[PDB]
Amino acid sequence: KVFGRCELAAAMKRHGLDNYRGYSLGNWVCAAKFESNFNTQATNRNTDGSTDYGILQINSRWWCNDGRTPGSRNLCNIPCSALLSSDITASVNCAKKIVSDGNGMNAWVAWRNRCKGTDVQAWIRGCRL
Ligand SMILES: [Cl-]
Ligand SMILES: [Cl-]
Ligand SMILES: [Cl-]
Ligand SMILES: [Cl-]
Ligand SMILES: [Cl-]
Ligand SMILES: [Cl-]
Ligand SMILES: [Cl-]
Ligand code: NA
Numbered sequence: 001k002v003f004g005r006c007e008l009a010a011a012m013k014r015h016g017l018d019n020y021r022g023y024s025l026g027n028w029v030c031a032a033k034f035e036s037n038f039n040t041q042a043t044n045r046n047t048d049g050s051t052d053y054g055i056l057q058i059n060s061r062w063w064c065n066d067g068r069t070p071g072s073r074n075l076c077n078i079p080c081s082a083l084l085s086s087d088i089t090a091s092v093n094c095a096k097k098i099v100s101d102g103n104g105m106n107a108w109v110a111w112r113n114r115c116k117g118t119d120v121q122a123w124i125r126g127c128r129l
Pocket of ligand 3: 065
């Protein structure tokens with residue numbers, strides 16, 4: 001599924017991402033925009049042979065099992081395929097684990113490089129939340 005901007009903001013708020021570990025909802029929407037363009041079916045193969053999955057491009061090296069990332073972990077205890085669902089529950093639950101890991105949202109290179117320090121509230125402007 002390709003979410004609308006305000007549609008995704010609403011889904012992320014209902015699943016308790018708004019101000020999760022102190023990151024306002026606009027941070028999460030900005031991250032999803034540059035990671036996946038709001039497309040739950042987004043995938044990206046890394047040079048190390050790991051893969052990124054779903055709206056927040058969660059990686060198979062630590063967070064999910066895809067059966068093809070040698071030596072990897074599955075800390076969210078999910079198949080990577082769950083991260084491509086039209087239902088973002090698995091993606092939000094796993095993101096909560098990642099953002100708790102010690103580096104906050106810096107875990108998302110695209111958030112650091114394109115969202116951090118910007119007017120992220122722009123991403124929820126207009127939305128009935
Ligand atoms: Cl947009
Ligand atoms: Cl915000
Ligand atoms: Cl594996
Ligand atoms: Cl594991
Ligand atoms: Cl699995
Ligand atoms: Cl959803
Ligand atoms: Cl933090
Ligand atoms: Na894995």
